[model samples]
Target chain A: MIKYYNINGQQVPVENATLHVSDLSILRGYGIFDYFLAREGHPLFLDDYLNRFYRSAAELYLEIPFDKAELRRQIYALLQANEVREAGIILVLTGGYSPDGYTPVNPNLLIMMYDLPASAWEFSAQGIKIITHPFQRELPEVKTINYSTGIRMLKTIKERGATDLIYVDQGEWIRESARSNFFLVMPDNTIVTADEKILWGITRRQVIDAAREAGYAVEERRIHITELDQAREAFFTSTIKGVMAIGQIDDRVFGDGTIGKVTQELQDLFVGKVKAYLETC
Target chain B: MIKYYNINGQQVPVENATLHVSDLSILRGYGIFDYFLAREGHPLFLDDYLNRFYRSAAELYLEIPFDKAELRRQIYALLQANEVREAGIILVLTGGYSPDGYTPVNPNLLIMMYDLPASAWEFSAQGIKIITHPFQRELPEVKTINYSTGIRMLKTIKERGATDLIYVDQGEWIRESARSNFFLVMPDNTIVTADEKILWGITRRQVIDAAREAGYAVEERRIHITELDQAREAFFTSTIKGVMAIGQIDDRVFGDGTIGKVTQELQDLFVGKVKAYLETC
Candidate 1:
């Protein structure tokens, strides 16, 4: 187990890491973060993740206070310090310390490393049940730290015997999952995913690319909940899960209640891409 | 001048009142808070504020970990240690430290004290400007720590030469100010304020009571933004400002751009109530 944390560029013992209670992030939960994985000491899609991280901070008007190269270097330094072959690296940028307590000031950057959880890969082959919940994330384009609504729904998620919740807005438009991007495969072999009001997840972009490469006709548009009944297959995409098929949403089963061929193909392509990423730079 | 903060009922140096970066309040902005003022070593309307604080925590499914009486004692002890005659006491209860980062665990209770800012009174006699912004708070009744959208509009508020932003729902219904409850006096002499989709500010309740007691017709219902032109007088209520009048909103002037008689009477009654409370409690 690794035990190092980088707080404002200073590496410290995880136990000793602390932030002032007055910091806007702690006081107001005003912050942004990016979570990505590393394999064999190599961060997968490091450059792309960093770009999203910068965009998230920029959307919050939070300046990272560190150059991209410096941040990348710190991640490597942390990897060397921890010696973890596989890990989840989280980069957080907060609205920083504000005496008045609501405005953004000098942003705080926190880099943390942890052992990648088994759940990321354990459930990839076996599709998980997802329950639909109505939600529309505020400022979904940025990876803001406000997850109260999603977290609050955890009890209901468990009670429903679902692994995660899929958000459908009041307009009956399927937005996204609590922590991942959603997609559905039509019987006609058309791949459809939400085009707006959702975090355009990095893995989602890769899946779209991989789907196109695999000769799937991908339609980037609003997928209404009514259309879910017509979806022959369904799945979600995220950095952790890559591409995981959905067995059931609410009471609706997708394609014999098993991982479909299209989902498997995209998942295989994603895994292949990851292997290439690690094998190369 | 105060160095005391109540961290889970224990008096600690304000400097040492730090929270871990992983705390849900910091990581997800998953927390609720109630702010009130203490005058002459007495927490003004302590019972009301405490009730609201408890209700806020309960709404967020955050347990206070300590009983109501115990929390009151801690606040008094912190006040005595700090020796502040006039101050603002802020009680924050967070979703606590999360190992998995999105679920609630044992909650963290943070009680902080600071001198009441001069702006609370400085802008009372001479009102300030407010501009209307189209937005509605999520879980407006909970008083959560998520103020990102409000804070992000700071530049717009300043650019419009307004001291604060008043949120109006998509339906053009006037909700509340960025940090206060909104009110207006109709030309027909009816006092109206938003009755739903807004935080039930303790000060707002007191103002309504004071207005009712002072022989003014008060209506608690939806106030449409379209009706702003019909408002003869306007003001906002908060723990910090009591019942400060609004001189202008957007391009419209409230009456003669001065504090109205009805607003002044309510403000005086509020101050009198505060004094009586201090004398008795």
Candidate 2:
């Protein structure tokens, strides 16, 4: 089921939805937005996600237009209005309308809900394949409504029969995947990643804590394209992909082209972490 | 004057505006949009701009729901509906909408109108000052809505007492102004730009054509940071800025630190080109 709403909290069925072409988000693509998934009666990571939502809003000089608590309250009400349980929730805040093209006068805000496929969770278990691209992600902060570079990377992946893309900058320094933080298991059983150029991934922090507490030798630094052949295993972490292991990058297979032992162990621990937290809460 | 509309061309206001937060355009900035100034019964660049509009839409794999001529007629109607003589016209088309977050479904088409401040035209004569930043524009063909890099670059300009910004990649090759095309008049009396990695500026094309006809040497190729210092004169072109001269890049002065003779000559030639074309039409 899909539903849409205005900032005033009025519900509108899916077919009736629309936006002004001149909205700054549509024109300049200068806006901040958030996504959340709910399970059972609880909204997952509601506070944490909205915190990042506001952080992105502040980073872009966008006025929340609605207060934090009020927006959160409306999100729950919107879900109830749409009769959505166990689904994907999307909340967007454009920089508002611009009476003039360059300066924003009023921002268009929206809340939308969609039926997230059950398979989104299962895909993380089987592992996924990715191909590295030459494009670089320039903006490391703020979840703005623009990802053309990400689209190019994903297109390359689909063309080569892969699930996603891992992109390095022009310098051959591995940055991260199109939508997730990346990690590699090296020949010496050490994990590596790029430096500060990568976004601060939410699931990445969770996995880092899990790995360190589990006593895995993890390192967060530069991973070069020239060094990919020597890596024992590699994986990516995201809100959606979770901690998916990698089988290959551009036909260079890792560990005979299958999920390695390190990936399997981490996936198990990640699932346990999710189950324990949900149960305890 | 801000109005939202559906694919069917129904006039809807902000109270009815609703769109999925996960619209492919919002998620990937995978849309191409065009802007023009509407005065009296004439929207500037009516046919010529639409040609470029279709070109941009086609490059992004967006099948504009309406053909070029039909779109032209509808825009004239929209201008009539708004009942404004002098306004800004914005036409936006995404590759289309999608239910699933990862794919394309149907295209979202919208056109909007807004009032323009009359005084903005005067800036062309004074020549707006701009600062250079180290952010590069990739995928310069399609006008993706990724203006955050431009926004960040604009912040640098604000600090430096300039009206806008011109961005160079990390290696110092000028890509474009935050929202305009750039031109440099060389010491050898040639006009050149960074080829391929910049948008095909509509006005830039006209100015180049006229300048070349007037016997000025022009080149569009990769120019590096080292070349900026040797250039005797510099200017930028855009649909909005017309042919404004560049007095400085960073802190260095260019061509006596004011609008150069070539810049003025070309601006006059540009006026002639437009006026002549208008009279002939």
Candidate 3:
């Protein structure tokens, strides 16, 4: 597939996709971005993702010169240009070029298109393991570009033989995974997840909606790390990985180290929603 | 003065100093940088600054391709190329290009040079007010490119009629300012500042040594916000501003709203050290 990137509304080859080194995103690591998967040239949940994208920019005070509709158009335009059946579309908004390299100026927005990697879907049939780490994200709800902590903790994640790491606030409450939302199936059969102080993943919203629609009670509140003991099953939600069940979290196996029934149901529902949405196009 | 940048040791026009959008530094805000001032074509405290730069990179697992001596040579080379007596040299190292945009790989190091602005000197003559806000940095020791909280708190800083905002940990301990090291003089004539869990500023080291040399007892420890009431004087240290006093913090006026004697002595000593170091070059 031909790769393309839309920088400040101008479509360019992926090779030519570049931003000034002085951009706050590069200089101060100051920027925000949103990502979603495109299935058969149709971006899944494009509107919802754009809403979060704009909110992320607003939270970071990044000025997105283009309107939501214009950005949406560019997404589809870039997707069609790439001609990829399955792809990952990343909308990045930086704090822009600054003469002093500290203050934010006219922001630069880039819509990057890339082919979906094989590893993204390689472990879909089986559940994955995750380890917990005590930490908190600054500006957790904004989806800022700062991922140093997450990337730095990759060593611990791999050492524990886990797929990813979930951040726990001082070992009290489970916040989120490095790239996804954390969810647990309680002993009472209630679907619980951290309600606030997170990126508010689009796929997370989909999973919650799917769960509630499927007659499962959903509770959006702080889930304590101790509550993990009462969790009959657990899973993570993200744009790329819609709803994947957690087989284990640091030696604690959930439901015999297999994908739980509730997780499978939510995954199926989310896939159904994706299929129905794409049918419109 | 000619504007140029050392992008991986290659001298390029400042305008052409652009990084690819896919670069992890721009894409994920995954990078670390160190800034120091150049006096008369000599990088003040070049060895110390380079030590901190490499330390920052190591903290983030960012691989800087060049060694310290080679990097120092490039700084001097760039300073001569720009021909700026008074300039700020920023060395940035980023978690290189990631195909998936998350995992760090070979890092990119860039030496960005800019002329010191008039505003930098404007604040030195007169002590400026700095407000305090409760916050914490993820990797407090490393000079990583994660300044979201600092940049975001700029509004509150200006709204409170302050020059900069000092981060208070849980409304208790004063950590550091956005871009400088925080210091305060106690009623017992002791100089206090955060000893650990903060970026070890080069100027801060200079001021501490200078203060000791000037017969002032310097104590590096956590200075609580409540202790501001007993502070006889206050100041901050940075590369551009060696030792600028703080007149007031929040509602407390430090020492008649003027630069304190201890602060002045240290500033003078710092300037003297700068002149001596430049003479060697």
Give the lDDT of residue A198 in candidate 3.
80
* Candidate 2 Cα misplacement greater than 4 A, ranges: A1-18, A66-72, A77-85, A105-109, A123-126, A152-156, B1-22, B38-47, B76-87, B114-125, B152-156, B255-257
Runs in model 1 deviating more than 4 A are A123-125
Q: Write down the DockQ of candidate 1.
A: 0.77
DockQ of each: 0.77, 0.47, 0.83
For candidate 3, the docking band is: high
Residue lDDT tens for model 3, B157-259: 7877887888898898889987899988887889999987788888888788888887888988877788888788888888877788898888888878889
Candidate 2 per-residue lDDT, tens place, B1-281, comes to: 64534343556664564455556765556677677766555776678788878887766656777788788888877767666667766677764666565466566777766676454334343445677777777678766666766754545567779877777877668778767888888877788787868888778888888999999988988878788887877788876667777776777778567777788888888877767655653
lDDT of 3 at A160: 71
Residues A1-281, candidate 1, lDDT per residue (tens digit)?
A: 88898999999898888887788877777889889999878888999999999998878878888889999999999988887879999888888888787778998899988889777744455678989887688888889988888887887889889979898987499989878999999999899999988998989988898889888999999887899988888898998888888989999888678898899999888888888888887
Candidate number with greatest lDDT: 1
Enumerate residue pairs that collide in model 3: none
The lDDT per prediction is: 0.86, 0.71, 0.84
RMSD of each: 1.5, 3.2, 1.7
Assess candidate 1 and give its TM-score to the true structure: 0.97
